[PDB]
Design a protein around this motif. Structure first.
Motif, short mmCIF file in Angstrom:
data_model
loop_
_atom_site.label_atom_id
_atom_site.label_comp_id
_atom_site.label_asym_id
_atom_site.label_seq_id
_atom_site.Cartn_x
_atom_site.Cartn_y
_atom_site.Cartn_z
N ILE A 85 40.42 48.46 33.26
CA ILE A 85 40.25 48.58 34.70
C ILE A 85 38.92 49.26 34.97
N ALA A 86 38.10 48.65 35.82
CA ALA A 86 36.88 49.27 36.29
C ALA A 86 36.84 49.17 37.81
N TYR A 87 36.12 50.09 38.45
CA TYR A 87 35.99 50.01 39.90
C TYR A 87 34.64 50.55 40.33
N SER A 88 34.10 49.93 41.37
CA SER A 88 32.81 50.31 41.94
C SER A 88 32.93 50.42 43.45
N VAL A 89 32.23 51.40 44.02
CA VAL A 89 32.18 51.60 45.46
C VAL A 89 30.77 51.26 45.93
N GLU A 90 30.67 50.27 46.81
CA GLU A 90 29.40 49.76 47.28
C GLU A 90 29.35 49.82 48.81
N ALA A 91 28.16 49.55 49.35
CA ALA A 91 27.99 49.52 50.79
C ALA A 91 28.64 48.28 51.38
N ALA A 92 29.23 48.44 52.56
CA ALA A 92 29.90 47.35 53.27
C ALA A 92 29.12 47.03 54.54
N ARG A 93 28.80 45.75 54.72
CA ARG A 93 28.05 45.29 55.89
C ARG A 93 29.04 45.03 57.02
N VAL A 94 29.35 46.09 57.76
CA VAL A 94 30.27 46.00 58.88
C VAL A 94 29.47 45.70 60.15
N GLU A 95 30.15 45.15 61.16
CA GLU A 95 29.47 44.68 62.36
C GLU A 95 28.66 45.79 63.03
N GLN A 96 29.28 46.94 63.27
CA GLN A 96 28.61 48.04 63.97
C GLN A 96 28.46 49.28 63.11
N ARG A 97 29.53 49.74 62.47
CA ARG A 97 29.48 50.97 61.70
C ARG A 97 28.73 50.75 60.39
N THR A 98 27.99 51.78 59.97
CA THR A 98 27.20 51.70 58.75
C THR A 98 27.60 52.73 57.70
N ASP A 99 28.64 53.52 57.94
CA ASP A 99 29.13 54.51 56.98
C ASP A 99 30.36 54.03 56.23
N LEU A 100 30.55 52.72 56.12
CA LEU A 100 31.76 52.15 55.55
C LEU A 100 31.49 51.62 54.15
N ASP A 101 32.55 51.56 53.34
CA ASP A 101 32.44 51.28 51.92
C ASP A 101 33.35 50.13 51.52
N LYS A 102 33.02 49.52 50.39
CA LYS A 102 33.77 48.42 49.79
C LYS A 102 34.12 48.79 48.36
N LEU A 103 35.35 48.51 47.96
CA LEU A 103 35.83 48.82 46.62
C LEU A 103 36.06 47.53 45.85
N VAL A 104 35.39 47.39 44.71
CA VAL A 104 35.54 46.22 43.85
C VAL A 104 36.22 46.68 42.57
N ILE A 105 37.39 46.11 42.29
CA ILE A 105 38.19 46.46 41.12
C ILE A 105 38.16 45.28 40.16
N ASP A 106 37.64 45.51 38.96
CA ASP A 106 37.58 44.51 37.90
C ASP A 106 38.76 44.79 36.97
N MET A 107 39.59 43.78 36.76
CA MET A 107 40.81 43.90 35.98
C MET A 107 40.77 42.90 34.84
N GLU A 108 40.82 43.40 33.61
CA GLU A 108 40.96 42.58 32.43
C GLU A 108 42.38 42.75 31.91
N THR A 109 43.14 41.65 31.89
CA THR A 109 44.55 41.66 31.55
C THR A 109 44.82 40.65 30.44
N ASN A 110 46.09 40.36 30.19
CA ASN A 110 46.47 39.27 29.30
C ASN A 110 46.80 37.99 30.05
N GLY A 111 46.64 37.98 31.37
CA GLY A 111 46.94 36.82 32.18
C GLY A 111 48.35 36.76 32.72
N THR A 112 49.23 37.67 32.29
CA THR A 112 50.62 37.62 32.73
C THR A 112 50.76 38.03 34.19
#
Lengths: 99, 50, 231
Positions: free
Chosen positions: C177-204
């Motif tokens: 499991i990995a996760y990154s917090v990046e900038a989010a391009r929201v319509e008006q607010r600019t202090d918002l964030d996006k969370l990307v979670i990378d999941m490596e599993t067995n496919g089940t």
């Protein structure tokens, strides 16, 4: 007398003989834990001068004493594994058991 | 002399690694395991590999 | 406002491979990205339900520490390969039985396992065994159980016939499991964030289902925090 390897172990039930064969030796592949009997052996014993309360117990509950004592090979404590081989060595002139 | 029968039993035990076991490298750096930590509690890199 | 937060929502599920995926959550306040990322990473890596091989029965085999004619690998190696088997069991079933009967020469893979339709094999190319003779035959009956965590053979509560080989089960389907917090391009607010979670599993386990289950577990424990009454 002669010490005998047999499954007719006194004062032991059936669950402890589940992993033993007819001869008195556990099978290959048996999962055993501490205290389990591997080879059933009975030893001839002399007369015991039992204490008075003990003969009270024997008189009330029956359960007459046997001529053999249980001196059997048991798995050491905190040891649990799989039987992978059994080797039987017999002196020349002695009846080779089934196993 | 005196023995009539011998029975030999081979027991196989799978011993897992546990606290108290001694682990070492090849440079004299011996040690004794103190804890088996859960995966989520150990340090990990940017890619997520602990 | 300074009291009402922005509820994060699922955005995009990118499935790079069968065992690898990315899940995007957006939007998130300042500092909530790391909080939710670490909570979800800890929950996913710890308590995800999954199906694993528990016990095996092979014809002519009495114990693990033995060989078989026409079989290149020992039975212990076959069990270690069976531990790396990815299987999905249809909901409502806990224990299932599958069969692997193969005769000939070549690699016995997971695609030769016969299932009753309630079990789906994720990795059909997993090499289970090698048969080195034309007369070599293998006949196995594998038990697959649903569980959570890691249950070794010793920890299982105790009649068991000689021939039933117990296999340590790792029920958890999540590997990395990995996760990154990046900038989010929201319509008006600019202090918002996006969370990307990378999941490596067995496919089940599916990514979306995993995220909802982790969120559900966190919600249940936070409920006991929310009430906060002496018992």
């Amino acid at each position: 007398g002669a010490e005998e390897i047999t499954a007719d172990i006194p004062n032991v039930g059936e669950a402890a003989l589940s992993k033993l064969d007819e001869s008195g030796i556990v099978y290959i592949g048996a999962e055993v834990k501490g205290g389990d009997i591997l080879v059933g052996k009975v030893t001839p014993k002399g007369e015991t001068q039992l204490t008075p309360e003990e003969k009270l117990l024997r008189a009330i509950f029956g359960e007459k004493a046997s001529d053999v004592k249980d001196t059997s090979l048991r798995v050491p404590n905190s040891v649990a594994g799989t039987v992978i081989d059994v080797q039987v060595f017999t002196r020349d002139g002695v009846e080779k058991d089934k196993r | 002399p005196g023995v009539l029968k011998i029975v030999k039993v081979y027991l196989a035990v799978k011993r897992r690694i546990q606290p108290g076991d001694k682990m070492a490298g090849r440079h004299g750096n011996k040690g004794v395991i103190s804890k088996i930590n859960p995966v989520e509690d150990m340090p990990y890199d940017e890619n997520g590999q602990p | 406002s300074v009291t009402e937060f922005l509820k994060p929502r699922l955005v995009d599920i990118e499935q790079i491979s069968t065992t690898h995926a990315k899940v995007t959550l957006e939007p998130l306040e300042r500092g909530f990205g790391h909080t939710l990322g670490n909570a979800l990473r800890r929950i996913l890596l710890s308590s995800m339900p999954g199906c694993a091989v528990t016990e095996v029965e092979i014809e002519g085999v009495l114990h693990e520490y033995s060989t078989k004619e026409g079989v290149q690998e020992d039975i212990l190696e076959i069990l270690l390969n069976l531990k790396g088997l990815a299987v999905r069991v249809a909901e409502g079933k806990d224990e299932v039985f599958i069969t692997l009967n193969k005769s000939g020469s070549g690699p016995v893979v997971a695609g030769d396992i016969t299932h009753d339709g309630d079990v789906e094999i994720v990795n059909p190319e997993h090499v289970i065994c090698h048969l080195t003779s034309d007369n070599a035959a293998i006949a196995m009956r594998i038990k697959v159980e649903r569980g959570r965590g890691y249950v070794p053979a010793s920890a299982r509560i105790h009649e068991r016939p000689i021939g039933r080989l117990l296999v340590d089960a790792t029920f958890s389907p999540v590997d990395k499991i990995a996760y990154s917090v990046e900038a989010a391009r929201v319509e008006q607010r600019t202090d918002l964030d996006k969370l990307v979670i990378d999941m490596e599993t067995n496919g089940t386990l599916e990514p979306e289902e995993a995220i909802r289950r982790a969120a559900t577990i966190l919600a249940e424990q936070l409920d006991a925090f929310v009430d906060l009454r002496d018992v």
